[PDB]
């Protein structure tokens with residue numbers, strides 16, 4: 001239904017370092033998909049916000065304790081989370097996807113992964129997927145303990161490709177990396193805006209109504225495209 | 233109760249950057265209180281571990297979907313977490329505390345904060361705590377949006393003190409920062425080792441047994457003191 005504010009300002013908790021969703025620019029101001037998108041949603045609906053960029057764990061606990069009204073933080077919607085949060089309509093799909101070098105034209109479909117070296121960060125959803133499909137597609141998996149070493153290996157040619165959460169890859173491309181995403185991604189759920197279960201229902205109404213308007217009026221795509229290599 | 237391992241190795245998920253609990257040293261190896269403490273606990277009990285420093289949110293989701301066995305990640309024990317995780321005995325009491333300059337003799341207690349300005353990061357427990365006691369002791373709160381600027385402000389004298397997580401302040405001091413902690417810390421919960429609720433009970437047993445042995449044998453304090461002094 002139509003959303004009416006019941007607070008002069010709503011407090012939103014978020015991560016302090018989760019690019020491209022929320023991160024600091026060179027001027028030390030917070031920015032990102034979540035920041036621009038929720039700000040644009042509130043503005044569309046005539047709500048006011050105050051952001052607390054405190055970290056994922058801290059943001060969860062702040063909403064649960066009533067010290068924040070909502071959480072916008074690259075948050076994967078899960079059944080475990082639904083036990084204690086209510087979510088707005090999902091605002092972005094999460095995918096696991098393959099990054100190649102943009103200079104390498106040899107990988108055009110999944111069948112071209114035959115004989116390739118694929119990187120993944122140890123213990124991640126990308127790692128689990130790659131391990132589970134290595135025999136089928138015929139690649140070999142090389143594991144990394146952190147993100148920097150993995151992306152360095154793709155750039156120096158010691159892996160042919162890697163799998164990661166798609167926003168990380170598409171943001172690196174937007175930043176200037178010579179990567180591409182030439183093949184089909186693997187759906188892996190959705191991102192959601194959350195309030196404590198049973199709390200601030202009008203803030204969820206705001207969210208859903210504002211989001212629908214931004215999807216229809218083009219601003220939603222403009223915001224995503226600012227941060228993620230768009231296909232268009 | 234005796235803990236017996238049922239796997240040759242258990243997988244532990246943790247955050248990639250939460251110093252001094254889990255973080256990378258200059259050699260890009262993962263280290264910290266959580267890493268050293270759970271490794272030592274595991275060793276004490278004859279269990280083997282493999283660590284995946286995937287990030288807090290990702291670690292939660294991995295344990296919940298059965299793709300990591302446990303989580304050791306500066307994890308505050310809360311009722312909401314008890315909905316979906318089982319915990320070992322708490323292994324650390326996380327407090328908030330005040331940092332002043334080590335050369336500033338003027339602040340030794342809360343009442344010495346009269347007329348002073350203290351920093352806190354917006355929307356944190358420290359921010360809430362300072363705001364709640366500002367009228368009582370007659371200080372002003374200056375809000376910061378990131379740690380680096382807040383700590384720089386203390387160092388350059390544009391604030392008189394700050395409040396932050398005690399381990400962050402104590403680790404900074406251990407690293408040579410010229411801060412003091414003149415005021416009694418404020419309790420802010422406890423950290424626990426987690427498994428998915430109903431899973432891996434022998435891993436919780438071994439955590440509890442090992443933690444108790446390390447408290448008794450001196451290693452627990454050695455590990456904490458390594459980082460916090």
Ligand SMILES: [Cl-]
Pocket residue numbers: 055056057058247288289
């Ligand atoms: Cl976090």
Ligand SMILES: [Cl-]
Pocket residue numbers: 057060292313
């Ligand atoms: Cl959580």
Ligand SMILES: [Cl-]
Pocket residue numbers: 045209
């Ligand atoms: Cl409307």
Ligand SMILES: [Cl-]
Pocket residue numbers: 060081289292
């Ligand atoms: Cl969570």
Ligand SMILES: [Mg+2]
Pocket residue numbers: 015017056249287288
């Ligand atoms: Mg993080």
Ligand SMILES: [Mg+2]
Pocket residue numbers: 076125290293
């Ligand atoms: Mg994930």
